[PDB]
Paper text:
Each [name] subunit contains six transmembrane segments (S1–S6): S1–S4 form the voltage-sensing domain (VSD) and the S5–S6 constitute the pore domain (PD). The C-terminal domain (CTD), which contains three helices, namely HA, HB, and HC, interacts with the calcium-modulated protein calmodulin ([name]). Here we report cryo-electron microscopy (cryo-EM) structures of human [name]-[name] in complex with three activators, namely the antiepileptic drug cannabidiol ([name]), the lipid phosphatidylinositol 4,5-bisphosphate ([name]), and HN37 (pynegabine), an antiepileptic drug in the clinical trial, in an either closed or open conformation.
Interestingly, two different [name]-CaMF104A maps were reconstructed from one dataset, which were designated [name]-CaMF104A-[name]-[name](-)-I and [name]-CaMF104A-[name]-[name]-II at 2.7 Å and 3.5 Å resolutions, respectively. In both maps, CBDA molecules maintain strong densities but those for CBDB are barely observed. The differential distribution of the [name]-CaMF104A-[name]-[name] particles with only CBDA bound in closed and open states indicates that with the presence of [name], (i) CBDA alone is able to stabilize some [name] channels in the open conformation, which accounts for ~20% of total channels, and (ii) CBDB further enhances this stabilization and dramatically increases the ratio of the open-conformation channels.
Numbering used by the authors:
A (entry chain A), B (entry chain B), C (entry chain D), D (entry chain G): 70 to 184, 195 to 367, 535 to 600
E (entry chain F), F (entry chain C), G (entry chain H), H (entry chain E): 6 to 148
Amino acid sequence: RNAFYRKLQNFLYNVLERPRGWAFIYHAYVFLLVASCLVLSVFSTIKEYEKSSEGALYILEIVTIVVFGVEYFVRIWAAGCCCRYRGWRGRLKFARKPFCVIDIMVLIASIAVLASALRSLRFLQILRMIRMDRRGGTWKLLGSVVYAHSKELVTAWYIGFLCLILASFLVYLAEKGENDHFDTYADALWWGLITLTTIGYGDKYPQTWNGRLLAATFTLIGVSFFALPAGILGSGFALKVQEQHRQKHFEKRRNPAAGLIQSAWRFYATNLSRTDLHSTWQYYERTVGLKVSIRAVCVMRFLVSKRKFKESLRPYDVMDVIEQYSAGHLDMLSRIKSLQSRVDQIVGRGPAIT
Amino acid sequence: RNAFYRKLQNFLYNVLERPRGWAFIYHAYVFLLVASCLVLSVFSTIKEYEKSSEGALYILEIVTIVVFGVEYFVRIWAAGCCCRYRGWRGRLKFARKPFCVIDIMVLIASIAVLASALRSLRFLQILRMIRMDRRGGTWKLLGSVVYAHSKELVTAWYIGFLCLILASFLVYLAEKGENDHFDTYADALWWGLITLTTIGYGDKYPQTWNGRLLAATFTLIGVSFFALPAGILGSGFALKVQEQHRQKHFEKRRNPAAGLIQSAWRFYATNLSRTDLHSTWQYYERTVGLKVSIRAVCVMRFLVSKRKFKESLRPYDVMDVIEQYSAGHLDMLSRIKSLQSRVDQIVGRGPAIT
Amino acid sequence: RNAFYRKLQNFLYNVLERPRGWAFIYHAYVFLLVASCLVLSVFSTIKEYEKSSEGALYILEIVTIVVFGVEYFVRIWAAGCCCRYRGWRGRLKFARKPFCVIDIMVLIASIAVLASALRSLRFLQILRMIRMDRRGGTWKLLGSVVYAHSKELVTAWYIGFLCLILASFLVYLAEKGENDHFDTYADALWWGLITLTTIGYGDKYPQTWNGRLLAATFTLIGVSFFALPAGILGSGFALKVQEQHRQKHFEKRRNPAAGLIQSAWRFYATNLSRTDLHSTWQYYERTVGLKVSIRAVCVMRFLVSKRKFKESLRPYDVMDVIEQYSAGHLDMLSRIKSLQSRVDQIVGRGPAIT
Amino acid sequence: RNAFYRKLQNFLYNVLERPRGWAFIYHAYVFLLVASCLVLSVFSTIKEYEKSSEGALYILEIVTIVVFGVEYFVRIWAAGCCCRYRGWRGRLKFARKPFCVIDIMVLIASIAVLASALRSLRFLQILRMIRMDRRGGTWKLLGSVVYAHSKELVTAWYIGFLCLILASFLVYLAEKGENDHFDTYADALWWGLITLTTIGYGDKYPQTWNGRLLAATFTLIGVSFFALPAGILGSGFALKVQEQHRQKHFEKRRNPAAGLIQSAWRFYATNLSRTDLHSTWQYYERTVGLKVSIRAVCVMRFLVSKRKFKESLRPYDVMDVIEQYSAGHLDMLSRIKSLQSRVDQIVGRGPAIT
Amino acid sequence: TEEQIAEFKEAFSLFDKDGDGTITTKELGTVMRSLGQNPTEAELQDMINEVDADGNGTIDFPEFLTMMARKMKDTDSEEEIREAFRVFDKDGNGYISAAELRHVMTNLGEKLTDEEVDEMIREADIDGDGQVNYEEFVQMMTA
Amino acid sequence: TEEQIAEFKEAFSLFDKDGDGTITTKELGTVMRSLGQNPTEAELQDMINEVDADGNGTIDFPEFLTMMARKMKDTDSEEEIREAFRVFDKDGNGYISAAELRHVMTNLGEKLTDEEVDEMIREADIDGDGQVNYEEFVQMMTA
Amino acid sequence: TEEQIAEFKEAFSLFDKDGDGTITTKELGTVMRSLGQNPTEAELQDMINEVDADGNGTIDFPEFLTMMARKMKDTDSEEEIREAFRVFDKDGNGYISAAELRHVMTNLGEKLTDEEVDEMIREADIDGDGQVNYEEFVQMMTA
Amino acid sequence: TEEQIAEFKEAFSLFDKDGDGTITTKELGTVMRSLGQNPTEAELQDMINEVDADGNGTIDFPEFLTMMARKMKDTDSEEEIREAFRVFDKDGNGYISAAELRHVMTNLGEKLTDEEVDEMIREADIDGDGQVNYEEFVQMMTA
Ligand SMILES: C=C(C)[C@@H]1CCC(C)=C[C@H]1c1c(O)cc(CCCCC)cc1O
Ligand SMILES: C=C(C)[C@@H]1CCC(C)=C[C@H]1c1c(O)cc(CCCCC)cc1O
């Protein structure tokens, strides 16, 4: 009985923690609920729809607070089934970590509001929305990509900022009085920013032909450098995800390698010809004609693990194949060295025989 | 006589189904006709040009419905020449598939309208426009690219959405009363979206210097992350099309390999020295000095297929060459193993001789 | 004397045709002159500055027509020094080609205007501006890139067009009467286009919250797919230029290979030990102790050409090194085959000796 | 005592020159100070906040001029500790370089203003802002990337400029009188530029349906080609930074290679069996059972340098592994050549023995 | 030889409860359960196809005879074990401390217990170094 | 030997209807049509240039003599057939069930009929396994 | 032999001031300081782990005995020195003028003085060319 | 031998007009002009550094002696010519019609005239095929 209970508790821990299959769907549905709550709050901000928006938002807030409370309680309960944390002491010690503290502050704030509150509700929604991540993967990825391309991003920022300043100042000089838009240099800076970024509100735009000419000649280059970082970060994201996939592939190679080595040792020790080695025999008897059956099972395990590992040795990359074949080529070097030594001993025997 | 009829029916099936050459041109011309119909409908929506637009659109609709009807009839007729579907039963069973149902519903709706109709006509035009694909290749490609980059797209969406929410809320706070544009948080969200995406309508824009400063500092980052997905998807499309090209190349390698193996077996069995093997001789006699002529033809076939296959073994990629040469290197390993065994037997004979 | 004349005429042909060094600077300066002419014409279009703009534009047009006439005359004159075309007949036959016809029509139109003319002048300026290319390299590159990525560009166009149509129609329905901007579906289509492309003029923008919501949810995806092609074409341009560089590198490898083979044959035939071969000796005597000096010169030529070719065998790519080393590895296969045959004959002699 | 003084002066030189660790933080903090000065100047330009903005800007300018003066003085002082420049003469000769001249002109201008000045202050701020680089790395990178992609950028510019001109002229013709926006061709050019770049101010936009149609059909292509260069430059930046990383990796390989060769020679000369070679022994005695201790130290140095170099021989690239393994494969060629010669001498001895 | 065939007869009778001369996936599952471990039906199918030459969903006796009779040398299991050990040897030095191996086999896949690891290390530390190179190891199983 | 030359004379007379000592593309086409198959003029040109040493648009007798006389070993046709079989062996195990081969040759290119595949498999299943490795196969044609 | 063991005893006493039979990082540091050079504690740890087989933070005597006793041939130090010289040979010609080598060792890492470079070049310029190929060099240390 | 040294003395006197024992770039240029061809000063420097062992801007006599005396086999000029011919053989078949070679040498670099190409082809068409493989060619110069 208790075995099923512990199995289900561990499954719950897995679901709330790193999900694989339909737990993604549960996370997506709670995401849908939170998103519906945000849009309902936005509508409640509007005056005309405030009535029905608030009417629905009250019940949606009730449902969402209930869901978040039960989720946090289940998370803390399942914290006491993992190896690191067990029972009550383990769960309480796990709660000492910061992320659980963020979640519990969010929950208590929700209870307090539900038991100038609009700003607090907005902040709590923002906090929980940043919370749904639960792992920080996105921020880690973004930081790694920025750090990897730090030089490209920094040079792009430098060139773009210099172009913004210069073009803005030149346009300001060219439209100091002939245009009401550019009365002050701050206005010119705002214009230059909203042009180079290609937002182009249209509230400010040069009207003197000198200003228009300067704006054109500078906005070409400015928009190019302002668009640079988008492509740079896209390429960085792609490369980083490829690297993560490569690392996961190498771990998936690591595990079956150990499986194969274990099975190979077991099969080697399972030969009936030799009896000095009994460790595998004792292990299989403890787990339990009979001995030949055990050897059959173990040789089958060796065969299947060999198949699994050989499949696991797929290229996935040029570098991988080059590495493996280069190990083979070093083996070739060793073998040809042995052949050289052997032919040397042959030529030594030559005169000895002759 | 009937041979020409069946050949032409199969050619029609090929043309309406996967096209290679000028069938692309026929598809492009029907695409031009449908596009002309859409633009004529758009103009008929306009009031000033409604007269001539409708006058031309009536005849264009007649022509387009006629063309679509004849195309569907030809498709159903040619469905009865392929291996899976023949005659009447095969064509009817093929029509049971969903895409033919979509086409027939489109046709019957066109007939009904041609025999508040504006909205129905618009919907029918949209349906047929999504129909011209006939294979779903574009949607398959887009879905595959999105799935492959699911992590990058998801993190970009997360960061961009968070930046949108935060910048919009800060601007709303900074312009709650000093600007009529940002009376409600929904207005602020609309502004933030139309800025970060760089659409920049200009209907809403911060006017307080605090709001302008916040908008600048947040819009830099926001526009960067909002532009990310375009580059990500471009790279994904490129990589996916490259992978499809690689797969097609491997199939084009597969076919001539079988051709070469067949020709090699035929030539080997075609030697006049041995007479136990007659299968190739019987086959060639059934198809039909004479025997040497047959051997000449078969050895020529072997030579030409060898040329074709060797050409078909072009690199197309580093991975391909590494794979082939690595097979060669494993062959090298086997050969050096044999040489090691041979030199071992030589050194064994040494003392035996000496 | 005439040697210098022909050398200078050939140099002029090279300068007007494919340039290498400072001929680029001459082309850039004539480009600057034409650009100054275009901007002067633009200013002459303006009313306020028409006086001085026209005053300068008249003399600039005189200078530009003179320069273009002299350039065309020099081109036709130098057409009669190349191998294909010589003298008068060669130059006239070269003029039969279309590009020279375009240039001469431009020149005669310029003379006629200079001897409603504003539109003709604008068209002539456009024609000459497209003319400065003189080789069609840019258009060839663009066409090749588009064809290579035809599938990606076509799917991007399909998805973007469908998104435009759908979003525009939904917004039109959501703002049929509540907004003056979207009275007709054509207005909605214009709006959707100027949003999805992120131009965002601001003349038309949804004002009903349903319309704003639809516009947001569709404009995210629409702007993503509308930005796709820019990145796709950028990647295509990069790859195509890399391929062109690779081809040029292979040609630069081709030439010194022939140089080395020629020098090697000459040196081999230059050995004083053998006298049957005199071709190289006769050639060097015709060009002209003495014979050993000739051999010294020829062996030096072999050494220097070997250095040049070995330098020319630089990697430039992984594929290149894999190809060369794979030729080496096939040589390894042949050598190990020979060694296998030799060890087989050794083991055959074994019993024969024993 | 003086040793610590010279060590600290050299450390100061390193900090002001190429920084590695927290010197980056000092540079970033001075960057923060200069940025605060720029924003304070911008605010002082505004009229409403001129009072407090100027009040803070005066003290900020005092602090910044003090910081820049002390930094320049420290730089000139530390110029006299490097190998090239020492003492007073070395520092003065170093000051003869242009960048120090730019810095000193900036400092003296700051003193003169601090001892129509607004424009001079703005120009001085711009000059110092471009100065913070101190190495020109960003401009070198940008120039190299532009030169590498000169063909792609030039063709993109050509196509985009032609599209701009053509679309602008067609729209001008289509809206000569029906729209006040496009009275002159210069107005049309401004519109076309602010559309194709996707700035879209909204001051000018076609209103005639012919003009709208032309604008759409041309703006698709125009915005694509106008966005091209951003992605092109992003890819170029990425590739250039990768190349720089590769070069730095190769230098980091160069240094430990020399370390290993030195240690290997020392260890080889350190063998106690041979006494003819004393150079290493004399060197170690000069630096100073005892001799065996010296050999122990030197063999340890060889082992540790071997570990360091072998680690330094990491792939970092496919090309690197191909190069190293290809050196190994040429070694294989030499070894198999030797084996061929040996088996040839064996087959020669065969008949001689037999 | 004949005694080997008789032992194979006895073994096949032990698995082949039905006595049909074929080892069904159910028979393999029940015999394995008697052994103790709990595999998956898909992994049982993997079992079959690895040992199933005739592709009948079972195991004809010749397949079983060949599989028992085959020796590790005949298995051509050198490059694969080589690559596995190379994977586990991060340094690429060709050697690995026996402590790391003990840790790995007791933590990965079919986790190996203390006695088995002691035995393998004893058979591996021929030089008594602990940094067992895997070349001697692979040639040890092959030999 | 001389009898081989006489047989080649008879064969050349059989193709060379014109008797000009050269096998024209038309002569090759008509003799092939007599054989039964229907190739394409471009493929006939491929025929020629593959066998046409002198590049005359026809076949001088020495080319025909060398082409008939050449043996598969002389053809240097080992790596190519090796690569083809490796391509068809998805697993890379070096082996392939004869059923898959039968399926392939009866479905790809110059489709092979039942008798031919039975013969090749008989000559290939020297060990009687069905999972014909292609190394024994290639050395079989070469030998 | 025994005299070698006695010399190792004397050396170990020289480093092992504590006389505990283990070479602590502090003992290694002080003996090195007596030698003259100034390494870093992290580099001293690198020392240990390179020579520390037992991983005790020190050096048991067998490790020291093996390290002194090991010869360059046993060290398997051919490919590494080969690659280093190949790195320094930009041309890839296989040769390098002794002047460049003299320049490099006097400027990189543990900078080498004049007498040492003269000695190595003398032992390297067996052919008296100055363009010392590194193959003869590597086989010289190995031999 | 001694007669070879005497011939080298005569040759060096022929180039070394100054009689200083060193072949200056000017002396090399004038002797080449007497030969007829017109090279470039940078290419003359390339000449020197290729043959200039001592790096004196000239040629000491030992360099000239070694350069004349060296044989193609000693030059280690097999892989380079191999790669050149492989480059010119587009098909990768290992063979090339002599007509293509004649075309190439008469059109690339130091263009080769009719007599030279006739001679090389005669020495190459040992089998009288015209499709000269380059393996026999390279072993011909080496031999
Ligand atoms: C984390 C992102 C998204 C990057 C990297 C960090 C930095 C400081 C800003 C982002 C960024 C811009 O958002 C805009 C530019 C263009 C220059 C604008 C002039 C101020 C460069 C630029 O790197
Ligand atoms: C140094 C940058 C950023 C590049 C390279 C140098 C050149 C002349 C301009 C930049 C650039 C544009 O800023 C805009 C375009 C699009 C065409 C616009 C039509 C005039 C191309 C284009 O290369």
